[PDB]
Design a protein around this ligand. Structure first.
Ligand SMILES: [Zn+2]
Lengths: 173, 285, 346, 154, 312, 285
């Protein structure tokens, strides 16, 4: 298996990396290849808690979270608040399909206990936020995909995508 | 395949053109030109075929059946046609230029955008598979230009700076160093970004007001003012004539198409607004 | 729908002669199975209440005052729920074998290409195909359409040359030639269908309805209607200065309103200033009399109120149109500041 | 392209419109907006620029009232009605070269003070003559229209 | 396996028939379908693969002998896929990621259902960013007066493509690739032109879910029409049902049959599969089997690009 | 044979002429002159036709039906017209000259450019093909001037140096000293290079400020000043009149066109800005 970690792109402060592990190997699923990001995956039935930025799970198929699949190990620091999957390709529901997968991988997603304390309420929110959109240019993807920000396909090609592709349901809790 | 051959050609406006479209667009023009999906002037395939078929029936009245077999047989007989025109695509529009000495001096230049050159390439790829007279000498040129997409480009001239249509300052870059030009007129061809080009092109389009005068008092009538749009002289539209495999098309492509140099398209012929020239990209390449 | 096909059958045989009805008879009988189906296809819904939801023992209960509001809420939802599936009334028809095998009854021309869709609908095949204006008589009378020549000018009066018609649309045209037949549906279970028809053949009401060429000629008609005597001598024969020879009427409260200025508002403007054999003539006629040649354009005006059905739910979208939308009522707390400012004010 | 030049023409005009206290100076400006725009495109930019400065009669508190107009809104142009008008139009032209980064604002503001540098300003504009004349057109044409509309006779 | 149809210019696939000057004092007009019916796409490939030694009066017994099996059609701009989505006369080109939560959406409470549906056909509907209605107007000139004839004017709303767009189908055959590839076709309409392109693409052939998308008109066999329309909510969750003509056959110059169908982009429940089988009789099952080969009864899972059938 | 007759003619201005603005592009001059696609002055054929039409409907009242045939009816057209006008290309403009030295001194000269002669050759070539006519006399002349392109030349005279329009210094080659003048004039014709010709030509144009005086104060009215653009006297345009076979085209070409010498084009006629002379190429050879 490949230790492919799936990281969120919400409106949250703690989104910087929270994983001090990187490509490690030489493989990845999502690619920015003269069209924009490839192979974005969607996590439906999950939310995001503003504080403690992680994927809060639910059962509403309408609530959904979208991120990328990078091969870095899950920070080697928590080992508790992470959902760890042994999953093939055909069960990775992806967007922008270009290349198929080795069809047996191991995925870690930022998790959270249900937190049955208070009643749930999940809110639709966008991430366009042109003042913040520039952060994401060099917050998440370039730190994994530096090759595109310097002498290759433009990093404005990534901008009109994240204000177009990623839009997640939050918690406002 | 039943498209044995394809004969692309350039439509060169000898006088201004006006192929009408009713009142389909807004700007202020009452009688605008025929547009396309993205706003540039085009000649529809219906207007381009009908004009060439209305012509060429007066020119070669003996070959009326050869033309009917290929171009439609407008009578109640409805045998299928053998020839198809594609919509004429704006290839290059003339533009006034002021270059900062920058050159052997020019006063006007040809201007294209990268949107317009993609549709030309689309037409060019699509018929390369059947044209065993492969015009890759031309298809490659568009390919190299499209590779340099994302900046203003001059193909053969060496200007590096100019003023297009008295309003737009652009800095130009050679293709890589040099390449033969398509239009054999001794005129540079600039390929602009799609945002800047759409303004420079819209500035070459001729939008006139026209007047109907009360002949007894020599003043304009009430509501005797309207607006029209023309496509300038020297404009270049590119289209293709696709032909099914038959014996009439062999005559049509050999006997009829060799003798088409000038035809008349569009309307307002009284103003002299239709004289155009076809150039048949099989000899200019 | 049946009782209107009934009356139309009865009435058309009453006037078995006179042309255009020996045609309507021939199709109201050839296409019985098709005309069984209503062409309109309504949709019905229903909710219910019980004594439990409204009474305690024999008096009203608390919070009962909202039962009607909540009951009407479910009714509205059930409509919008069903509006998700659009079933056109043509789908109910059975046309597979009528088009695969040439069993479609085609009174008139024969389709060189199958079945020749209707010119009004566009969806259904046509039953009454019409020849073009090569010439009609020698092509009407030979074919089954016209029994003779006298009926031709009566068929042409209701069906244009070249016009194909489906069974449903001919019923629209037949009722368009006699709108009093609508009384069958208007009254309902009051008079027998035969008694309704009898009063229609026991009279000669002629209800002329405008066309888009008539509407495009108001200012022209209304101009030659006050320059009558001057515009009158020159023609004297062109039915423009004809004198009203009948007492026909119309629902159009402009045709009724004049109709009586020796102007004969019944003339089809497409045999006149809007014609081709007579265009330049009436241009010259209008030229000498300072009458402006008419414009071929009318205006189709269609009004509809905003959020009315949404207002029947008591919502506030008709008040704050756009500021709050119908979608906002899935969570009214997001617009709590405004929906309250209005409601508190009301 | 020049969609923000109709905006610029409105702030530049509203400045000139207010630093023209005398009524005959507004009328004199309306005369410059019409005429000066039509020599820049028939006679050329710098031939008209030379004509503008020669009639502007610089080298005074006026030449420093211009510097204030770039930022302040209480500045006033004092002088001959023909001088304030010609100098107010010099502002209009210079206000554009600043806001559009054709000429560096720091250079222009210190070239409008140091007598020795003004010749270097005219020397800079000579090489930017083709570039400038192209861009100011929409801007100056708008100033011409605003003048004919806002500057009225009593 | 997969076939991309690249339109080189605006196309027109008109429905409703009768686009020609018949009445004297009246213009003609025609619209265009956003997605070509499978009969159109079948007739196109059938035109390439044509041998006179066949048919003689069939047009589908003759057509089904040429092509193996075609699967329904959708849109592909830049490797993205867009799929028809239909409502009470609204049509939308929605992206794959938005069909997942349709069955849960169509079951929500009243007010939460309308809002979710409304935002699909207005905000998340990506049709008008991809396709514009170019309302071309044509005219016939009489050489006598050299003006327009008596009302020989027609309006034809073509299908203008703002971006690069292909129509996507799949074929069971693989000996078909090097025949229909790089071919210039006269993709059905007003004598318009598209280009063909074949590349391999792996997708499912048969699946089971409780809600399918209709990637092609689902033909109703005209005998179950009564037992089907009276209870329509049991079979169609949302979409549009109407009577359509299957087209116009070239070899005989006749309009094809006219039978009720469930228009592409509708959401059909699982109850529609077994209902059809238990209503269609083998007298017509042999017929409707052909209708499926040319590509009519094509279903798609709201999960993923998995293409089912009904009789297959 | 597409055109029955084809009549190229020069348009010599007797007074300064002014054909109105027309266009929609905003410009500095208040009432500008009609512009070409290269920016040179021209006359839209819609203005040639309307002016010549109304002139003929006065000078030939008996042939008022031959004119309605060839030039179209006015109030209720059953049929398209038969005659066409082509837009009047600027052929030569006068420019005052300070001749440095030569045997014969000159005070003014005709200035033309190579870009303008190319548009004329485009008219002559297409009209030659779309008709029985063959203007080989002009075409042989202009095709010799266009061979020397990219170099200032004086047609017949011997100048070698001059200062045109007080601001432009040019050195001139001699072409052949044997080829006859294009038009009948002792004034030489300089075929300037298109870059320097554009600026020399803009100097010959006549910009004019006019006012409306208050009658009771003898001062300019409130905002009663405006500018205006004229084309000088002696300016030569070039257009073509074309016609299809109708038995009135033959009468048009026989009487009407052979008795047309002076017409009033453009506007500002009350101040004499329209008088012009037509010289048919059948005659000026
Ligand atoms: Zn109908």
């Amino acid at each position: 298996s490949t230790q492919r970690e799936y990281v969120f792109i919400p409106i949250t402060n703690s989104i910087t990396i929270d994983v001090k592990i990187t490509i490690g190997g030489s493989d990845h699923i999502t690619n920015i290849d003269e069209r924009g990001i490839h192979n974005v995956l969607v996590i439906t039935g999950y939310a995001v808690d503003e504080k403690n930025g992680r994927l809060v799970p639910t059962l509403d198929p309408c609530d959904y979270v979208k991120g990328i699949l990078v091969a870095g190990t899950p920070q080697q620091a928590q080992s508790n608040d992470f959902l760890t999957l042994k999953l093939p390709a055909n069960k990775l529901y992806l967007i922008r399909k270009k290349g198929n997968i080795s069809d047996d991988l191991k995925i870690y997603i930022p998790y959270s206990s249900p937190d049955a304390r208070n009643s749930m309420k999940t809110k639709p929110v966008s991430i366009s936020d042109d003042t913040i959109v520039n952060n994401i240019i060099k917050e998440v993807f370039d730190k994994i995909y530096n090759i595109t920000q310097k002498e290759k396909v433009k990093i404005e090609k990534v901008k009109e995508d994240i204000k177009e592709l990623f839009s997640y349901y939050a918690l406002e809790q | 395949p039943y498209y044995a051959f394809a004969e692309p050609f350039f439509i060169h406006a000898i006088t201004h053109l006006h192929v009408g479209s009713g009142s389909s667009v807004e700007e202020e023009i009452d009688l605008p030109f025929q547009r396309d999906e993205l706003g540039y002037p085009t000649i529809y395939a219906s207007s381009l075929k009908g004009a060439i078929k209305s012509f060429l029936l007066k020119e070669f009245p003996d070959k009326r059946d050869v033309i009917y077999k290929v171009l439609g047989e407008d009578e109640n007989p409805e045998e299928a046609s053998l020839g198809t025109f594609l919509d004429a695509i704006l290839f290059a529009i003339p533009s006034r230029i002021i270059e900062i000495d920058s050159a052997k001096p020019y006063v006007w230049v040809y201007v294209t955008t990268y949107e317009l050159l993609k549709k030309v390439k689309l037409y060019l790829d699509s018929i390369s598979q059947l044209s065993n007279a492969s015009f890759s000498n031309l298809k490659n040129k568009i390919d190299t230009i499209l590779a340099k997409e994302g900046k203003n480009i001059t193909l053969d001239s060496d200007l590096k700076s100019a003023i297009l249509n008295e309003d737009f300052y652009v800095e130009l870059e050679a293709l890589n160093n040099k390449i033969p030009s398509i239009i054999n007129a001794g005129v540079p061809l600039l390929v602009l970004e799609d945002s800047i080009g759409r303004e420079v092109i819209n500035r070459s389009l001729i939008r006139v007001r026209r007047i109907r005068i009360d002949r007894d008092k020599k003043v304009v009538e009430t509501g005797g003012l309207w607006s029209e749009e023309y496509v300038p002289m020297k404009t270049i539209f590119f289209s293709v004539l696709l032909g099914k495999e038959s014996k009439e098309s062999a005559i049509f492509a050999s006997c009829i198409l060799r003798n088409l140099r000038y035809v008349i398209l569009g309307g307002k012929e009284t103003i002299g607004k239709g004289i155009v020239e076809l150039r048949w990209v099989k000899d200019v390449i | 729908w049946r009782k209107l096909i009934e009356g139309l059958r009865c009435y058309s045989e009453r006037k078995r002669e006179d042309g255009f009805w020996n045609l309507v008879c021939r199709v109201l009988k050839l296409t019985e199975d098709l005309l069984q189906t209503t062409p309109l296809n309504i949709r019905v819904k229903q909710v219910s209440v019980t004594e439990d939801e409204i009474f305690n023992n024999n008096k009203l209960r608390s919070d009962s005052w909202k039962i009607y509001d909540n009951k009407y809420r479910q009714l509205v939802s059930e409509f919008k729920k069903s509006k998700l599936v659009k079933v056109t009334p043509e789908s109910r028809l059975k046309l597979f074998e009528l088009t695969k095998f040439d069993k479609l009854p085609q009174i008139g021309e024969k389709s060189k290409r199958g079945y020749e869709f209707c010119t009004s609908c566009g969806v259904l095949p046509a039953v009454v195909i019409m020849p073009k204006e090569d010439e009609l008589e020698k092509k009407l009378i030979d074919l089954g359409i016209a029994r003779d020549e006298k009926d031709v000018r009566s068929i042409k009066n209701m069906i244009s040359p070249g016009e194909r018609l489906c069974p449903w649309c001919l019923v629209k045209r037949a009722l368009g030639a006699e709108p009093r037949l609508m009384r069958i549906l208007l009254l309902g279970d009051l008079y027998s269908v035969e008694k309704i028809v009898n009063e229609i053949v026991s009279r000669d009401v002629k209800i002329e309805i405008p066309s888009t060429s008539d509407i495009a000629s108001i200012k022209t008609f209304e101009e030659m209607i006050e320059k009558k005597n001057e515009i009158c001598e020159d023609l004297k024969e062109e039915e423009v200065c004809e004198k009203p020879s009948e007492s026909v009427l119309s629902m159009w409260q402009w045709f009724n309103k004049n109709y009586y200025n020796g102007i004969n508002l019944t003339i089809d403007p497409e045999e006149y200033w809007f014609s081709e054999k007579r265009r330049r003539y009436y241009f010259s006629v209008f030229r000498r009399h300072r009458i402006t040649f008419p414009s071929p354009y009318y205006a189709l005006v269609r009004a509809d109120s905003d959020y009315l059905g949404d207002l029947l739910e008591g919502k506030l979208t008709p008040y704050l149109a756009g500021i709050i939308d119908s979608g906002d009522y899935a969570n009214i707390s997001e617009k709590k500041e405004e929906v309250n400012k209005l409601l508190e004010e009301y | 392209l020049y969609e923000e030049d109709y905006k610029l023409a409105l702030e530049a005009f509203k400045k000139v419109f207010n630093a023209l206290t005398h009524y005959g100076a507004k009328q004199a400006f309306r005369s410059r907006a019409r005429d000066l725009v039509e020599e820049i495109y028939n006679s050329g930019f710098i031939p008209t620029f030379f004509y503008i400065i020669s009639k502007a009669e610089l080298n005074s508190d006026s030449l420093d009232s211009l510097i204030s107009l770039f930022s302040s809104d209480n500045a006033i142009l004092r002088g001959s009605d023909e001088n304030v008008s010609y100098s107010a139009y010099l502002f209009i032209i210079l206000y554009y070269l600043i806001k559009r980064g054709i000429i560096e604002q720091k250079f222009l503001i210190q070239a409008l003070r140091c007598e020795k540098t003004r010749l270097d300003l005219i020397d800079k504009l000579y090489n930017l003559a083709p570039i400038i004349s192209a861009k100011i057109r929409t801007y100056l044409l708008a100033i011409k229209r605003l003048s004919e509309a806002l500057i009225e006779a009593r | 396996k997969r076939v991309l149809i690249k339109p080189l210019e605006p196309l027109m696939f008109r429905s409703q028939g009768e686009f020609e000057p018949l009445i004297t004092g009246s213009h003609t007009a025609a619209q265009s379908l956003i997605i070509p019916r499978p009969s159109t796409i079948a007739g196109m490939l059938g035109y390439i693969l044509f041998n006179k030694s066949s048919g003689t009066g069939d047009w589908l017994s003759d057509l089904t002998n040429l092509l193996a099996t075609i699967y329904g059609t959708f849109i592909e701009t830049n490797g993205e896929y867009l799929f028809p989505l239909r409502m009470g006369n609204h049509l939308a080109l929605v992206d794959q990621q938005h069909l997942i939560n349709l069955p849960t959406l169509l079951e929500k409470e009243y007010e939460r259902r309308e809002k979710g549906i409304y935002e699909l056909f207005y905000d998340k509907n990506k049709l008008f960013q991809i396709i514009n209605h170019q309302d071309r107007i044509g005219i016939s000139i009489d050489k006598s007066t050299r003006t327009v004839k008596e009302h020989y004017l027609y309006s034809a709303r073509y299908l203008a493509f703002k971006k690069e767009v292909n129509y996507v189908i799949f074929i069971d055959n693989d000996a078909i690739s090097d025949k229909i590839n790089g071919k210039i076709v006269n993709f059905g309409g007003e004598n318009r032109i598209a280009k063909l392109e074949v590349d391999d693409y792996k997708v499912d052939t048969s699946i089971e879910e409780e809600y399918y998308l209709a990637l092609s008109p689902i033909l109703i066999p005209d005998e179950a029409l009564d037992n089907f329309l009276d209870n329509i909510s049991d079979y169609v969750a949302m979409g549009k049902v109407d009577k359509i003509s299957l087209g116009f056959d070239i070899a005989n110059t006749k309009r094809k049959e006219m039978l009720t169908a469930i228009l592409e982009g509708s959401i059909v429940k699982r109850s529609i599969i077994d209902f059809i089988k238990n209503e269609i009789k083998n007298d017509l099952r042999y017929r409707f089997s052909k209708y499926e080969k040319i590509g009519y009864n094509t279903l798609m899972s709201l999960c993923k690009l998995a293409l089912r059938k009904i009789l297959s």
